[PDB]
Amino acid sequence: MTTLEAFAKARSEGRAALIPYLTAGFPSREGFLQAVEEVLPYADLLEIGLPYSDGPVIQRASELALRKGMSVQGALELVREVRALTEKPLFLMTYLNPVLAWGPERFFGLFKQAGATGVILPDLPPDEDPGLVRLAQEIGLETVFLLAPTSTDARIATVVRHATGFVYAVSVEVKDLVRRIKARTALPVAVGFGVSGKATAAQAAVADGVVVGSALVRALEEGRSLAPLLQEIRQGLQRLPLP
């Protein structure tokens, strides 16, 4: 199930893909693995975050995961164990600092080896280091880059020529942003707008995919079942002159 196939399946079913995002090792290593099991039935693709020292909800999750010993090596084994559970696309979200510490070629090589389909690099404007981007892609990883509501048409054009797998629009109104990105690329467009239930999901349903991250941190923090929450979101992702 390639990334493209995952998005296509959701579209053929008349819904935006649901992309759970879980921070590796949060609330604990075992807690993370159990969360993975609970969200898989709702996942078209899965995002796994690599905890890093430097919104507040995700920062909280990364903080605790780190306090409990999560590391790059710990995340690599977790990616392997998640890959053993599913054939679905798995994307590792990581800031650049840890990648530079391990060495890009080694870092990307290890995660590709571990079973990752690609990486999401939030703090790397692809146009600023195409060499690094090509390195990850040559290794076999899809590379997702970010766009924000402030992105000009030129910056959308610039980012979509480096992104593979999908492009991610984050608002740390959805229809307008999705329209402007889709006008410049056929790549699937995923959005992150703090979706937490049916109503908010319905507003984001226009996107090819919707990431659910902060809402899961809260559910995990409060010790609540994840299925009810994801079910409400799934139901909202199902699709129905101005001056």
From Swiss-Prot:
The active site is at E47 (proton acceptor). One of its GO terms (molecular function) is tryptophan synthase activity. The keyword Lyase applies. The keyword Amino-acid biosynthesis applies. It comes from the Bacteria. It catalyses: (1S,2R)-1-C-(indol-3-yl)glycerol 3-phosphate + L-serine = D-glyceraldehyde 3-phosphate + L-tryptophan + H2O. One of its GO terms (cellular component) is cytosol. Tetramer of two alpha and two beta chains. HAMAP family: Trp_synth_alpha. The alpha subunit is responsible for the aldol cleavage of indoleglycerol phosphate to indole and glyceraldehyde 3-phosphate. This is Tryptophan synthase alpha chain. It comes from Thermus thermophilus (strain ATCC BAA-163 / DSM 7039 / HB27). The gene is trpA.
